Design an enzyme around this catalytic site. Structure first.
Site, PDB file in Angstrom:
ATOM      1  CE  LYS A   1      -4.051  -2.222   0.461  1.00 14.64           C
ATOM      2  NZ  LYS A   1      -5.065  -2.300  -0.629  1.00 14.64           N
TER       3      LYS A   1
ATOM      4  CG  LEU B   1      10.492   7.040   4.615  1.00 15.25           C
ATOM      5  CD1 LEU B   1       9.272   6.371   3.974  1.00 15.25           C
ATOM      6  CD2 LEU B   1      10.415   8.543   4.401  1.00 15.25           C
ATOM      7  CD  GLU B   2       8.567   9.213  13.101  1.00 15.09           C
ATOM      8  OE1 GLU B   2       8.032   9.058  14.217  1.00 15.09           O
ATOM      9  OE2 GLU B   2       8.476  10.282  12.447  1.00 15.09           O
TER      10      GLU B   2
ATOM     11  CG  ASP C   1      -5.954   9.598  -0.747  1.00 19.39           C
ATOM     12  OD1 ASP C   1      -7.033  10.202  -0.559  1.00 19.39           O
ATOM     13  OD2 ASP C   1      -5.933   8.410  -1.126  1.00 19.39           O
TER      14      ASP C   1
ATOM     15  CD  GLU D   1      -5.975   0.913   3.676  1.00 21.88           C
ATOM     16  OE1 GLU D   1      -5.225  -0.091   3.663  1.00 21.88           O
ATOM     17  OE2 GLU D   1      -6.789   1.166   2.764  1.00 21.88           O
TER      18      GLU D   1
END
Ligand SMILES: COc1ccc(C(=O)Nc2ccccc2)cc1NC(=O)CCSCc1cnc2[nH]ccc2c1
Ligand SMILES: COc1ccc(C(=O)Nc2ccccc2)cc1NC(=O)CCSCc1cnc2[nH]ccc2c1
Lengths: 252, 252
Positions: free
Chosen positions: B16, B83-84, B129, B133
């Protein structure tokens, strides 16, 4: 107005504009276009109220470069729009006929577009998709905007506001880019980022990657390049388009 | 940074979020997420330069409710985002677990969202967006925005500007609507306009047609109703959300 006031003739636009017919008002013999909207489709899209707001504004507008809505009426199952008929057809059809436009024709069309778009913004008139198929030509060959009919590109559906789903996101900065695309297409015969696949067209737009054919003059190149800016705030404004030297030199 | 500085572990998000992996910096043993972008896909989409602009801004941002980009590097065929890692997973997963959130949890999440979104606007950080999610949860359960990855709904492709095709059209007025949708979904368990078919969801959004279950309190109803306005300019602002009595009474 009622349905019985009109003789309905041939369908117009091969369905590109919805259910639209050449029509004549029976008592005055005046030629116009009648667009038929089905209430069931309006209701299923949830746009009944948005339609009412838009047609209320349009019915009060008068501008030589915007297609006129003379009025409207309804019955049990339909809404009817009484529209100006543009006898010379679409700018798309004219471009198909000529392959490309000379600098005079182009600069004149760009001036008419800039005037129409400026007026739309000042009167808060929503328009949806600026492209040659949606631009019409009046009796004297004057251009008329007619783009009023209606996972995603804006994200996930359930979270999107009405302005996104109703195609109401063409503001003045968006229109500036569209005007550069149109100027190029008028002079060249195709829009600058056109490619066989959607993927490749996307790439060309994002990169602002395009080339001028040799016949495109320095003044036209300047105008187009100053409109097709990746950064929205850097695009040449509608007022500045009308003041551009190439437009001044070539517009009728 | 180089690829050799990291031990790559399990994939995160079932695709995703793209190609994302749980990772550990080898020398410090620090746990993070590594996102792998393929240059060939970036090039084919024409987004290489847009990516660079966005990551340059992000690498300088620090906010407790925005997922952090620690840094980035590249090799011959890939770009790597450091990234974190949000250890508590997505707000979507939490909502699935609890069915719905109480007023305290909801008001706290809404405050964190409003703070994150306000900061994004002031620092000119594009996000794409807003939905459960795409919202992540940190070590202490604080919400973190993570929605940075990427005929149409906006019209015909060849005439669309970069901001439309690159998903850069979520401005503050759009976000206000999204925040109302999220507030409702947190309290109820589903977004307000959800329906089996896309057509019916469209209709419900355009009509702003939704109902509150009985358990939704007067204060929550007021907040939601003042955000879900069809007219963009009438929506309650982020500052006004933070000052709303229901938010004040219930936020941690
Ligand atoms: C002012 O105009 C319009 C006003 C409103 C709408 C509309 O449908 N609004 C809507 C519908 C549902 C929900 C919300 C809003 C459409 C138009 N305009 C057109 O549809 C294109 C020209 S059709 C006429 C016409 C004339 N002259 C021609 N010459 C050759 C072809 C031709 C075709
Ligand atoms: C700051 O963040 C981002 C920055 C940039 C981009 C990006 O792809 N930019 C882009 C790409 C191409 C063209 C233009 C721009 C994406 C993100 N963020 C995510 O992709 C989602 C979190 S992935 C990490 C993560 C962490 N913690 C978790 N916990 C559970 C799952 C999980 C997943």
């Amino acid at each position: 107005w009622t349905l019985e006031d009109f003789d309905i003739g041939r369908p117009l636009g091969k369905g590109k504009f919805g259910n639209v017919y050449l029509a004549r008002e029976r008592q005055s013999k005046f030629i116009l276009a009648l667009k038929v909207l089905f209430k069931t489709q309006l209701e299923k899209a949830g746009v009944e109220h948005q339609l009412r707001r838009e047609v209320e504004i349009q019915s009060h507008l008068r501008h030589p470069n915007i297609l006129r809505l003379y009025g409207y009426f309804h019955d049990a199952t339909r809404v009817y729009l009484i529209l100006e008929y543009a006898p010379l057809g679409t700018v798309y059809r004219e471009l198909q006929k000529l392959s490309r436009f000379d600098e005079q024709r182009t600069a004149t069309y760009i001036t008419e577009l800039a005037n129409a778009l400026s007026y739309c913004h000042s009167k808060r008139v929503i328009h949806r998709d600026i492209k040659p198929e949606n631009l019409l030509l009046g009796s004297n060959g004057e251009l008329k905007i007619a783009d009023f009919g209606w996972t995603t590109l804006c994200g996930t559906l359930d979270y999107l506001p009405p302005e996104m789903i109703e195609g109401r996101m063409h503001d003045e900065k968006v229109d500036l880019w569209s005007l550069g695309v149109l100027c190029y297409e008028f002079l060249v015969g195709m829009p600058p980022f056109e490619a066989h696949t959607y993927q490749e067209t996307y790439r060309r737009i994002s990169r602002v990657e395009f080339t001028f054919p040799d016949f495109v003059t320095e003044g036209a190149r300047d105008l187009i390049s100053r409109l097709l800016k990746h950064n929205a705030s850097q695009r040449l404004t509608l007022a500045e388009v009308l003041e551009h030297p190439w437009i001044k030199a070539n517009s009728s």
